[PDB]
Paper text:
One class of biocatalysts, at the forefront of industrial applications, are transaminases (TAs), pyridoxal-5′-phosphate (PLP) dependent enzymes catalyzing the shuttling of an amino group between an amine and a carbonyl group, producing chiral primary amines, a highly desired reaction in industry. RTAs share their fold type with branched chain amino transferases (BCATs) and d-amino acid transaminases (dATAs), which are significantly more abundant in nature and well-characterized, while RTAs remained elusive prior to Höhne et al. (2010) describing a consensus motif. To expand the toolbox of RTAs in order to include more inherently stable catalysts, the identification of a homolog of the RTA from Aspergillus terreus (AtRTA) from the thermotolerant fungus Thermomyces stellatus (TsRTA) is here described together with its 2.2 Å crystal structure. TsRTA retained 40% activity when incubated at 40°C for 7 days, whereas AtRTA lost almost 90% activity within 24 h.
Two TsRTA chains (Chains A and B) were present in the asymmetric unit, with an estimated Matthew's coefficient of 2.7 Å3/Da (54.4 % solvent content). Electron density was well-defined for residues 1–319 in both polypeptide chains (A and B) present in the asymmetric unit, but it was absent for TsRTA residues 320–334, in addition to the C-terminal His-tag, due to flexibility in this region. Both polypeptide chains exhibit high structural similarity, with an RMSD of 0.24 Å for 319 aligned Cα atoms, as calculated using the CCP4i program SUPERPOSE. The TsRTA monomer adopts the classical aminotransferase class IV fold (InterPro: IPR001544; Pfam PF01063) with a significant content of both α-helices and β-strands (3 β-sheets) and can be observed to be sub-divided into two smaller sub-domains. The active site pocket houses a single PLP molecule, covalently bound to each TsRTA chain via an imino bond with the conserved active site lysine residue (K178) and additional hydrogen bonds (2.6–3.0 Å) formed between the phosphate group of PLP and side chain atoms from residues R77, E211, T237, and T273 (conserved in AtRTA); the phosphate group is further stabilized by hydrogen bonds with R77 and N219 via two conserved water molecules. E211 forms a hydrogen bond (2.8 Å) with the pyridine nitrogen; for other class IV members, it is suggested that the role of this residue is to maintain the pyridine ring in its protonated form, thus stabilizing the carbanion reaction intermediate. The pyridine ring is further stabilized by hydrophobic residues with a conserved leucine residue (L233) and the backbone of a conserved phenylalanine (F215). SEC unexpectedly revealed that 90% of TsRTA in solution exists as a tetramer, with only 10% adopting the dimeric form.
Residue numbers in the entry:
A (entry chain A), B (entry chain A): 1 to 319
The structure:
């Protein structure tokens, strides 16, 4: 369990140093209407009908150890999300990239959660002519967010297959469009908490796994990785999982994963930008296999963080 | 078609008078953090995790001809919406009532769209302890909004049964909780527009009608009114429709309404606070019956606006 120490110890050191620098901007910076403002003072107009009706999409790249991770993948997914929503990125993609690097640089944050939001704008879809709709852009940079805290990743967390809620189906809301309409996920969070666990796994209502509240799901069984194809966000972390798995000779099947498979899996882990590779030790109050972080999961964990220093997948920021 | 003239002519006169008064506050007033501010300057903090994840509920009473319509019904539905979301109205209900009356009074608006929003607050559900969650309140007053403009209600609008999208199911998001997660409704709006119509009727994906983008649906067939029970908001307008129908001896069945019934209906109309009683002359590009506003619909229209002057359902505002 060495590489986790090196990763987490490095993170700790950089957090210790950022508090020492006392920079007020290291609490976060936002981009709103062409202007960079401190995070705790960034505000959205109530007249942004888009934002009001959550008629928007968003995406969250990260910065780790001063390096932006797969930014172009996130920008490309955001553009595809916009197109599916009949939205348009209000600024050229390369300018968004420049602003984001500047914001991270000016903030001094070495490990950052970065968020880009495109909304319909001030005039909503209902009863407005196409000429009158002007999409709006919001961006943000802030310290890295953990869906699983570093102290838990060596042991793994507690999940449940949710039984009081199921995933919004693609015929209502396209799950490949990263969105903030979290009604089902929030029910899943409360259900997990009510049942004495932390992470909800949502079904599709048809006996298959989909995803959870802010993460994709992966099963390991007899040396093969399984993760749902339909009904889920096509995560960039999931993508990196496939890259590491291929590089290490593990097969990954992106396909229909029945709920039943979760109860027989050798290993389970979640993956997401806000936290990385997140092992699950128990499901529905029962141990996953031996209740430990599995070997294939640790290989995926190691490779995922290793690739944060591959220039094919990252670039360094000048602060 | 007299009573529509009296209603719309009165509305016109009051709009003519509000423009004459030139009051800048007659464009709207908002309540944000204890302070009343002009609408075009009201802003929401990006750190409102609730609002960000649309982890909120809301409700929209109206003011017509200087009288608040069924405010207590809306406040009661909002409280029930909060309870289902494990939210709490941050101020006592009677104080919210007082603020809203004051806001309408100070604004001078005689015909108003009024909106109350309760969000999870600055600390979201995920990874926060129950002690750290403080729900936040937002309110707004602005000129009356029409989902169907007065000029169209005498003739009726053009609807379609949506075929590219279906209603979010209650097992994902409780439709009796008025909410702003409009992903499916926005797809329905674009589909309607693509097909040359205006109003989408969403199915439940199981061959029954539910509701539309901001309105309940009612069918009239052989002297009986039909409106879906499950999968929809229990509208206050729908409630008033039942009151008028009962008073006039018409039966209303709140039950499963198959999609097939829409294609054989004698009359169809939508109902919502933002516009009232809204007849539909065509469905899927075909006439509804004779393509005219039907008689039972006009009786419902007349009674609905009549009851805006019944003290059992309204009170007058002192401006
Ligand atoms: C963000 C998120 C994921 C993970 O996607 P990444 O691109 O790896 O961050 C998966 N599912 C949902 C619902 C998410 O919000
Ligand atoms: C607001 C709305 C209605 C109508 O409800 P009222 O209380 O009559 O205003 C119906 N369905 C949806 C989805 C709505 O947003
Ligand atoms: Na996106
Ligand atoms: Na998946
Ligand atoms: Na409500
Ligand atoms: Na109904």
């Amino acid at each position: 369990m060495a590489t986790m120490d090196k990763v987490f110890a490095g993170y700790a050191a950089r957090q210790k140093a950022m508090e020492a620098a006392g920079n007020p901007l290291s609490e976060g910076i936002a981009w709103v209407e062409g202007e960079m403002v401190p995070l705790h003072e960034a505000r959205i107009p109530m007249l942004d009908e888009g934002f009001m009706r959550s008629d928007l999409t968003y995406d969250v790249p990260s910065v780790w150890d001063g390096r932006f991770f797969r930014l172009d993948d996130h920008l490309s997914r955001l553009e595809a999300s916009c197109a599916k929503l009949r939205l348009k990125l209000p600024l050229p993609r390369e300018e968004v990239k420049k602003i984001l690097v500047e914001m991270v640089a000016k903030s001094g944050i070495r490990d950052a959660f970065v968020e880009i939001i495109v909304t319909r704008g001030l005039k909503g879809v209902r009863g407005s002519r196409p000429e009158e709709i002007v999409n709006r852009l919001y961006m943000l940079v802030q310290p890295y967010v953990w869906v699983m805290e570093p102290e838990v990743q060596p042991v793994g967390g507690d999940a449940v297959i949710a039984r009081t809620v199921r995933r919004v189906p693609p015929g209502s809301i396209d799950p490949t469009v990263k969105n903030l309409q979290w009604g089902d996920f929030v029910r899943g969070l409360f259900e997990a908490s009510d049942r004495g666990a932390t992470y909800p796994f949502l079904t599709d209502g048809d006996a298959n796994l989909t995803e959870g509240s802010g993460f994709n799901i992966v099963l390991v069984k007899d040396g093969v990785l399984y993760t749902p194809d339909r009904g889920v966000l096509q995560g960039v972390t999931r993508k990196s999982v496939i890259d590491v798995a291929n590089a290490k000779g593990f097969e990954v099947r992106v396909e229909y994963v029945p709920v039943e498979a979760a109860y027989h899996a050798d290993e389970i882990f979640m993956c997401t930008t806000a936290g990385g590779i997140m092992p699950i030790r128990s499901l529905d109050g029962k141990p996953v296999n031996d209740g430990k972080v599995g070997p294939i999961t640790k290989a995926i964990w190691d490779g995922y963080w290793e690739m944060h220093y591959d220039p094919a997948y990252s670039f360094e920021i000048k602060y």
